[PDB]
Design a protein around this ligand. Sequence first.
Ligand code: FPF
Ligand code: MG
Ligand code: MG
Ligand code: MG
Length: 515
Amino acid sequence: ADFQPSIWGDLFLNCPDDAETEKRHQQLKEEVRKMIVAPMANSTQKLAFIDSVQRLGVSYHFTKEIEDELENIYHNNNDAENDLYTTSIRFRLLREHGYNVSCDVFNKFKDEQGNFKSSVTSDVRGLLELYQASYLRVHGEDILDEAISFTTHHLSLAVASLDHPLSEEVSHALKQSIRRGLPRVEARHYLSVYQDESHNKALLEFAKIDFNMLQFLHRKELSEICRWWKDLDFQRKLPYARDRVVEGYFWISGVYFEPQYSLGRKMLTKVIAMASIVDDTYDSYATYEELIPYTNAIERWDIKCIDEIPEYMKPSYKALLDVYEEMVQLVAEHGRQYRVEYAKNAMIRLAQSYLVEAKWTLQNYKPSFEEFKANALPTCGYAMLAITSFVGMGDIVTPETFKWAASDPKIIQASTIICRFMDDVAEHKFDCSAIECYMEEYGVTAQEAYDVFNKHVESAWKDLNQEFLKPTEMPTEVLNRSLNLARVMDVLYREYVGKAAKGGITSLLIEPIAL
Ligand SMILES: CC(C)=CCC/C(C)=C/CC/C(C)=C(\F)COP(=O)(O)OP(=O)(O)O
Ligand SMILES: [Mg+2]
Ligand SMILES: [Mg+2]
Ligand SMILES: [Mg+2]
């Protein structure tokens, strides 16, 4: 076809490229540590402050300290009474962190009529926090179900009369919640709004420097991956293949940005790249008769299968077996090989579902509704990315972790729903369409369809939140992988490569922050 190329060209290829500032960093870090443990004027300020530490992208340094503060605040509360702001932010932060705070804390804010009290509509700061906090609602919490609409409405009505920076913060929240945003894309935006009165000087400085140090690190990782990709030469060799390596790395850097997951991003990014090439190969001038050997050789995964596939497919097969064979070397130094087979297996599952999707488009065979229902969720590859993301995490991950991920746990389901359903609407809205099928099956309209699909996304989100409420099926760092994948969707597939991918790639990878 028309091979490649990335819109980024060689911007990221070459390796990227002050000790005083590193010493600053080390020192600010301890200062910020101590302002988290030390008292503030009251519980609300301690809460606001932790919120900022989280929103500025640096809470990963202070996980235990922040946790201890939140436990105290949970076990030591006079619900009666905090404002709407104190109640909301406390409910949001505690729920994010797994504490079972009842939605009844919002009862107090209604009139006997059952409408939201009149006073409430005037408390913008309180509406913002309530707005944000209602993205933490799970099932059976109608008050927060009402809150989201109530607050959405009255906030758009107040944007006009607001003075910066509060204005910016509102307009932004109606576009992007704190909860479904990608921590790092949001961090870059809050760094700007936080700089604008009474903000903590040392927080804001540490977060600026930390942001650049990480950016440096990612810039190193992305250069190692691009050099890797450049040698594959999928340019001449695979005319029909897109080039989405940078966009992949961004997706994956959303699964985890932290320093400790550096090997993770590396392995994960190669995987998603090959997945892409595999996807495209099922979506090119491959005929079905070529796809069954291909899929067949993927199922058996052995270099000997390379002689059994059409010549044009050998380069993707060899690249593919090479990625995993490498994952095994990189992870051998702690005897974590056993993780790789699980990831192989998920790639294979994914390729089997591509085979079926392909037969449908190439043989134009209209599937019944539940034939379609059964085969659609596993074309997503979020099970594959979650599972594979574990390969390069630390000891928190365990053979049991892979036994749980393979069994389809509620948190991977929820993220799959979110993926499959946002990806469909987004395609129709802006061959084989879930919406197109829903329209035929129940005889409704695109809009009425969008209605039902989004209604499902929101319920999937409620399941997701719920999966963090203690006790949990798995450690938090295991669940965040799935949360973050759900966040990649909300950020990247809502109303190429898109102003969203381009916009985020620039702020996290190209433009540093002026100290
Ligand atoms: C996604 C980027 C880079 C920017 C955002 C722009 C938008 C809204 C893209 C929606 C199109 C898209 C990538 C898909 F439908 C994924 O289909 P894919 O072919 O990737 O997987 P299948 O589900 O069709 O097998
Ligand atoms: Mg595709
Ligand atoms: Mg496809
Ligand atoms: Mg698609």
